[PDB]
Design a protein around this ligand. Structure first.
Ligand code: BLA
Length: 243
């Protein structure tokens, strides 16, 4: 988890480096246990007719978080990617923390982060709404509109092309704030009823089914590994549907 053993870290975009470190720092003192990904995946690389894709995976769990997945990736020399989801244990009804940063030699092209709902009413729990509203509306110059499958994201979702260093840092600090709120709520969360647990499970299943519609992610995987490998990776590794 220190990321000192990461082969990719030294070479990734600096915003991706700071976010990876912030996430790792948020997790470091938790009652972590390993989470074995399919085939006990760690590092993986592939190439077909174009550029190589290299991926590093770290994954944990705690009693509140079913699966805590931090992934770093690079395609050839251009394209750097950070992907992170904290999948909640439905028993506790926490939202889904998620982040995706994509960067090229021209800087960060996409920075996305959210705490996504799992309630059937599509709202975050009241304590989250309150804490998030207190952060205030962050100003970013270059907002990006979510695709239709993006209905899963909350009203606090960030999706921008950072314009400059000030904005990169403002985005990273907002992610730190989201992680601080989320880790705090995890300690105050009580186990829920069977009907509420079920309702939260359904929201997490929906979230994964929608995230699988991301053709931008799927194309990157397909270009290095092929269609069948990409379908397995998106459905079993990135956005597994619980059951
Ligand atoms: C191997 C992993 C992995 C890869 C290969 C990947 C690729 C990837 N995701 C993208 C966008 C995107 N990614 C997301 C969102 C997310 N994606 C997530 O994995 C999570 C957790 C969220 C949100 C919290 C969204 C909303 C877009 C834009 C999709 C579109 O523009 O149609 C893009 C286009 C970036 C851009 O337009 O500037 C690429 C190349 N993302 C990854 O995670």
């Amino acid at each position: 988890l220190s990321l000192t053993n990461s082969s990719l870290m030294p070479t990734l975009n600096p915003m991706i480096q700071q976010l990876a470190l912030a996430i790792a720092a948020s997790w470091q003192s938790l009652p972590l246990k390993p989470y074995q990904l399919p085939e006990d995946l760690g590092y993986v690389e592939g190439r077909l007719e174009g550029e190589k894709l290299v991926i590093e995976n770290r994954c944990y769990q705690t009693p509140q978080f079913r699966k805590m997945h931090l992934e770093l990736a690079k395609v050839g020399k251009g394209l750097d990617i950070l992907h992170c989801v904290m999948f909640p244990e439905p028993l506790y009804g926490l939202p889904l923390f998620g982040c995706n940063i994509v960067a090229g030699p021209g800087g960060v092209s996409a920075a996305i982060a959210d705490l996504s709902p799992t309630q059937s009413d599509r709202q975050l729990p009241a304590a989250y709404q309150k804490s998030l509203a207190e952060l205030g509306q962050p100003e970013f110059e270059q907002q990006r509109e979510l695709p239709p499958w993006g209905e899963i994201f909350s009203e606090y979702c960030l999706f921008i092309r950072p314009s400059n260093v000030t904005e990169e840092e403002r985005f990273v600090q907002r992610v730190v704030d989201f992680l601080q709120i989320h880790c705090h709520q995890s300690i105050v969360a009580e186990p829920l009823s069977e009907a509420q647990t079920l309702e939260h499970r359904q929201g997490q299943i929906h979230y994964c089914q929608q995230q699988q519609k991301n053709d931008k992610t799927r194309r990157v995987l397909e270009k290095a590994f092929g269609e069948a490998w990409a379908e397995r990776y998106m459905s079993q590794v990135l956005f597994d549907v619980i059951q």
